Amino acid sequence: SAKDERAREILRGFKLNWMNLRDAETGKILWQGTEDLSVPGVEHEARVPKKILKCKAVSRELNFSSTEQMEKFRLEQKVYFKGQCLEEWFFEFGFVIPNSTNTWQSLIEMMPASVLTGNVIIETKFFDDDLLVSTSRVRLFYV
Numbered sequence: 001s002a003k004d005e006r007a008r009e010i011l012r013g014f015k016l017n018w019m020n021l022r023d024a025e026t027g028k029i030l031w032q033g034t035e036d037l038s039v040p041g042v043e044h045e046a047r048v049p050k051k052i053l054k055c056k057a058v059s060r061e062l063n064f065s066s067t068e069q070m071e072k073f074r075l076e077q078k079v080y081f082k083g084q085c086l087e088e089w090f091f092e093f094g095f096v097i098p099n100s101t102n103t104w105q106s107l108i109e110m111m112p113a114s115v116l117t118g119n120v121i122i123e124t125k126f127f128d129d130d131l132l133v134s135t136s137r138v139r140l141f142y143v
Ligand SMILES: CCc1cccc(CCN(CC2CCNCC2)S(=O)(=O)CCCCn2nc(C)c3c(C)n(-c4ccc(C)cc4)nc3c2=O)c1
Pocket: 016, 019, 021, 037, 038, 046, 048, 052, 053, 054, 055, 056, 057, 058, 060, 075, 077, 079, 081, 086, 087, 108, 109, 110, 111, 116, 120, 122, 124, 126, 136, 138, 140
């Protein structure tokens, strides 16, 4: 289909270059990744320090690249706990310039670590407006 071929167009030329998870009161970096975790069809792993759980909020800064233009680049993220959706996050970047490289900052604002580690999956849905480009998943260990 036209929408299904466009969604593959954007996906082929997309890249998550790096991602930072900082403490939002100190800017202190708690976890850095350079893998492309937007890559679907794979269960990625993320071993973040458990101190992230004590933080009031967390600043998530990522840098991505897109060959294809995107009118309204947004994210639908679901936090699964033991296979059921615990929370639903929504973030919107907006217009993406074709062949552009963009850094995007967002702010994520409980249960003990021993319970969450290995039992938290983050499903991130990649949208351009109403078109879904891809779906990736990351498993979280709180070391
Ligand atoms: C509701 C109860 C509960 C239960 C379990 C867990 C939580 C929240 C956990 N915590 C946030 C809290 C911590 C304590 N109070 C402050 C906020 S957390 O541990 O800090 C998470 C920090 C990491 C979140 N995260 N991680 C990755 C790896 C991501 C990737 C790859 N993409 C990604 C984005 C775009 C694309 C195209 C592709 C991919 N988006 C990611 C992302 O959002 C809550």
